[PDB]
Motif scaffolding. Structure first.
Motif, mmCIF file in Angstrom:
data_model
loop_
_atom_site.group_PDB
_atom_site.id
_atom_site.type_symbol
_atom_site.label_atom_id
_atom_site.label_comp_id
_atom_site.label_asym_id
_atom_site.label_seq_id
_atom_site.Cartn_x
_atom_site.Cartn_y
_atom_site.Cartn_z
ATOM 1 N N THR A 1 3.968 1.089 18.132
ATOM 2 C CA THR A 1 5.099 0.173 18.056
ATOM 3 C C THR A 1 4.691 -1.219 17.602
ATOM 4 O O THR A 1 3.729 -1.791 18.112
ATOM 5 C CB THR A 1 5.807 0.082 19.422
ATOM 6 O OG1 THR A 1 6.231 1.393 19.818
ATOM 7 C CG2 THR A 1 7.020 -0.845 19.359
ATOM 8 N N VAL A 2 5.439 -1.743 16.634
ATOM 9 C CA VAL A 2 5.278 -3.110 16.154
ATOM 10 C C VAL A 2 6.335 -3.964 16.842
ATOM 11 O O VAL A 2 7.525 -3.649 16.764
ATOM 12 C CB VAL A 2 5.471 -3.193 14.626
ATOM 13 C CG1 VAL A 2 5.244 -4.616 14.128
ATOM 14 C CG2 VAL A 2 4.547 -2.205 13.919
ATOM 15 N N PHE B 1 -3.202 -3.310 8.580
ATOM 16 C CA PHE B 1 -2.085 -4.230 8.411
ATOM 17 C C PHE B 1 -2.305 -5.106 7.186
ATOM 18 O O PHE B 1 -3.418 -5.582 6.950
ATOM 19 C CB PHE B 1 -1.887 -5.096 9.652
ATOM 20 C CG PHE B 1 -0.541 -5.756 9.706
ATOM 21 C CD1 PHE B 1 0.573 -5.046 10.124
ATOM 22 C CD2 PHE B 1 -0.383 -7.078 9.315
ATOM 23 C CE1 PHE B 1 1.820 -5.645 10.161
ATOM 24 C CE2 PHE B 1 0.861 -7.684 9.352
ATOM 25 C CZ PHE B 1 1.964 -6.966 9.775
ATOM 26 N N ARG B 2 -1.241 -5.309 6.410
ATOM 27 C CA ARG B 2 -1.292 -6.125 5.198
ATOM 28 C C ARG B 2 -0.063 -7.016 5.078
ATOM 29 O O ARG B 2 1.017 -6.664 5.557
ATOM 30 C CB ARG B 2 -1.364 -5.234 3.960
ATOM 31 C CG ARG B 2 -2.604 -4.365 3.877
ATOM 32 C CD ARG B 2 -2.528 -3.444 2.675
ATOM 33 N NE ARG B 2 -3.666 -2.536 2.620
ATOM 34 C CZ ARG B 2 -3.833 -1.586 1.704
ATOM 35 N NH1 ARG B 2 -2.931 -1.400 0.744
ATOM 36 N NH2 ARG B 2 -4.913 -0.813 1.750
ATOM 37 N N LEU B 3 -0.243 -8.162 4.426
ATOM 38 C CA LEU B 3 0.848 -9.083 4.119
ATOM 39 C C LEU B 3 0.943 -9.263 2.601
ATOM 40 O O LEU B 3 -0.002 -9.742 1.969
ATOM 41 C CB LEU B 3 0.607 -10.433 4.797
ATOM 42 C CG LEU B 3 1.601 -11.569 4.527
ATOM 43 C CD1 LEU B 3 3.024 -11.178 4.897
ATOM 44 C CD2 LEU B 3 1.178 -12.821 5.280
ATOM 45 N N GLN C 1 10.236 -6.823 4.672
ATOM 46 C CA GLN C 1 10.409 -5.388 4.479
ATOM 47 C C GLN C 1 9.110 -4.722 4.911
ATOM 48 O O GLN C 1 8.116 -4.735 4.176
ATOM 49 C CB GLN C 1 10.730 -5.051 3.021
ATOM 50 C CG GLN C 1 12.167 -5.355 2.615
ATOM 51 C CD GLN C 1 13.191 -4.497 3.342
ATOM 52 O OE1 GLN C 1 12.871 -3.435 3.882
ATOM 53 N NE2 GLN C 1 14.435 -4.959 3.357
ATOM 54 N N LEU C 2 9.126 -4.167 6.120
ATOM 55 C CA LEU C 2 7.946 -3.555 6.711
ATOM 56 C C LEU C 2 7.848 -2.096 6.286
ATOM 57 O O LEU C 2 8.728 -1.293 6.606
ATOM 58 C CB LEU C 2 8.013 -3.655 8.237
ATOM 59 C CG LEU C 2 6.721 -3.357 9.001
ATOM 60 C CD1 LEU C 2 5.688 -4.448 8.759
ATOM 61 C CD2 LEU C 2 7.005 -3.209 10.488
ATOM 62 N N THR C 3 6.782 -1.763 5.562
ATOM 63 C CA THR C 3 6.548 -0.398 5.101
ATOM 64 C C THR C 3 5.349 0.209 5.822
ATOM 65 O O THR C 3 4.324 -0.449 5.988
ATOM 66 C CB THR C 3 6.311 -0.355 3.581
ATOM 67 O OG1 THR C 3 7.460 -0.877 2.904
ATOM 68 C CG2 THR C 3 6.057 1.073 3.106
ATOM 69 N N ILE D 1 -1.066 2.608 7.176
ATOM 70 C CA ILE D 1 -1.060 1.369 6.408
ATOM 71 C C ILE D 1 0.291 0.697 6.594
ATOM 72 O O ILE D 1 1.332 1.309 6.350
ATOM 73 C CB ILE D 1 -1.319 1.616 4.906
ATOM 74 C CG1 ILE D 1 -2.658 2.338 4.708
ATOM 75 C CG2 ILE D 1 -1.301 0.297 4.136
ATOM 76 C CD1 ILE D 1 -2.933 2.761 3.280
ATOM 77 N N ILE D 2 0.264 -0.560 7.030
ATOM 78 C CA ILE D 2 1.478 -1.311 7.329
ATOM 79 C C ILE D 2 1.523 -2.583 6.482
ATOM 80 O O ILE D 2 0.735 -3.506 6.701
ATOM 81 C CB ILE D 2 1.554 -1.662 8.829
ATOM 82 C CG1 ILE D 2 1.462 -0.386 9.677
ATOM 83 C CG2 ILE D 2 2.848 -2.407 9.138
ATOM 84 C CD1 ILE D 2 1.249 -0.637 11.153
ATOM 85 N N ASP D 3 2.442 -2.622 5.518
ATOM 86 C CA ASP D 3 2.587 -3.767 4.619
ATOM 87 C C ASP D 3 3.872 -4.530 4.930
ATOM 88 O O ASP D 3 4.977 -3.994 4.787
ATOM 89 C CB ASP D 3 2.584 -3.301 3.156
ATOM 90 C CG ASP D 3 2.602 -4.460 2.154
ATOM 91 O OD1 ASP D 3 2.140 -5.577 2.482
ATOM 92 O OD2 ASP D 3 3.073 -4.241 1.015
ATOM 93 N N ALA D 4 3.713 -5.777 5.365
ATOM 94 C CA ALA D 4 4.835 -6.683 5.560
ATOM 95 C C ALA D 4 5.061 -7.459 4.266
ATOM 96 O O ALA D 4 4.225 -8.272 3.875
ATOM 97 C CB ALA D 4 4.558 -7.636 6.713
#
Lengths: 132, 133
Positions: free
Chosen positions: B19-20, B62-64, B108-110, B127-130
């Motif tokens: 969970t984020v 995690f990525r931005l 947009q969180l992918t 992989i979580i890209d914000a």
């Protein structure tokens, strides 16, 4: 020996397509930051090229082409050994293309040529295999 | 664009989820019905829980505002996400609490699901890209 094949339609998925040997299943690629930045991943007799968009694109395969590619979106050059007569080109869950490329060593240059630029009016990937 | 990347973080997944959520909030466990399962996420308040394939030691990337394409995955989920205060957490049930310095605003969180077999980390990778909006 110079040769150019007719354009071949290919459905691109997962921003990639792979050039590999005739009687082999291509290995799992290591998509590192560097590999993605360079625009390709190579392993055990195969090269997966980064593709711009997921769509039905044309593969324009060439052997020792005299023609020059004047303009492009991306240009990638990679060494490539061919173990048997013939190679395959394929994307994830696409049809398998075949080209009777002779055995030996090549420098594979892949030009990404978007539909906007292409004479074929569709995303075009020009692959020239130059005999080393 | 403001680009930022984080070191991969190992995380023990329990109950097929992580969970984020906001820096100062305590998120509940989501109702993982067949619909939510098929969607691959479940949201509530200022928190999003993502479905995981199995309970194992997974890696969270995690990525931005990354433009690096993800060439291998079995699930892609893109969800709107608002950050109330500068910072977020990522956590599974009874796992370590991860923290990421993400600014306030809309994103947009992918989330891409990359199973061990496809990951160069050789473990289930998420992989979580914000992407800023």
């Amino acid at each position: 020996m110079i040769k150019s094949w007719k354009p071949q339609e290919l459905s691109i998925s997962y921003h990639q397509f792979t050039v590999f040997q005739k009687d082999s299943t291509p290995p799992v690629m290591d998509w590192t930051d560097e590999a993605i930045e360079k625009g390709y991943a190579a392993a055990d007799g195969a090269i997966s090229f980064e593709a711009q968009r997921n769509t039905k694109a044309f593969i324009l395969f060439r052997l020792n082409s005299s023609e020059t590619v004047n303009s492009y979106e991306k240009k990638v050059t990679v060494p490539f050994h061919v173990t048997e007569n013939g190679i395959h080109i394929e994307s994830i869950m696409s049809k398998r293309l075949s080209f009777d490329l002779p055995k030996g060593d090549y420098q594979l240059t892949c030009w990404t040529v978007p539909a906007e630029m292409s004479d074929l009016h569709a995303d075009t990937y020009i692959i020239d295999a130059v005999s080393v």
